[PDB]
Amino acid sequence: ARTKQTAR
Amino acid sequence: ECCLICRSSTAGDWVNCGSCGEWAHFGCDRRPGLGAFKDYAKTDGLEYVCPNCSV
Ligand SMILES: [Zn+2]
Ligand SMILES: [Zn+2]
């Protein structure tokens, strides 16, 4: 899948 | 913008639904059998389909 990991 | 399940945009592991194109924290989807974010994040990883789009 299209994914992302965020931290803001 | 935000998680289709919890409606926040807090930090974490995110998957995009391949049906509706909305985003969700992978951790907010508690359906049995989903496995781990890893199996989605890699190339040719599984497709994520959110709870509403699934059936
Ligand atoms: Zn969420
Ligand atoms: Zn969906």
Q: Which of B21, B19, B2 is nearest to B10 (CA)?
A: B2
Residue with tokens 């992978």: B26
CB A3 to CB B14 under 8 A?
A: yes
How far is B55 from B45, CA to CA, in rounded Å? 21
Q: Please, which residues 1-8 of chain A have a Cβ atom closer than 8 Å to chain B?
A: 1-8
> Which method, experimentally, gave rise to this model?
X-ray
Residue B12, both tokens: 């974490």
Domain ranges of chain B: 1-55
Instruction: Residue B14: count other Cβ atoms within 10 Å of its Cβ.
Output: 23
Q: What angle do CA B11, B27, B30 make, to 5 degrees?
A: 160
Query: C-alpha distances in angstroms, B19 versus A7, B11, B35, B46?
Result: 25, 23, 19, 13
Resolution of the coordinates, Å: 1.9
Chain A environment of B43 (Cβ under 8 Å): none
**B10 in reach of chain A (CB within 8 A):** yes
SS3 B48: coil
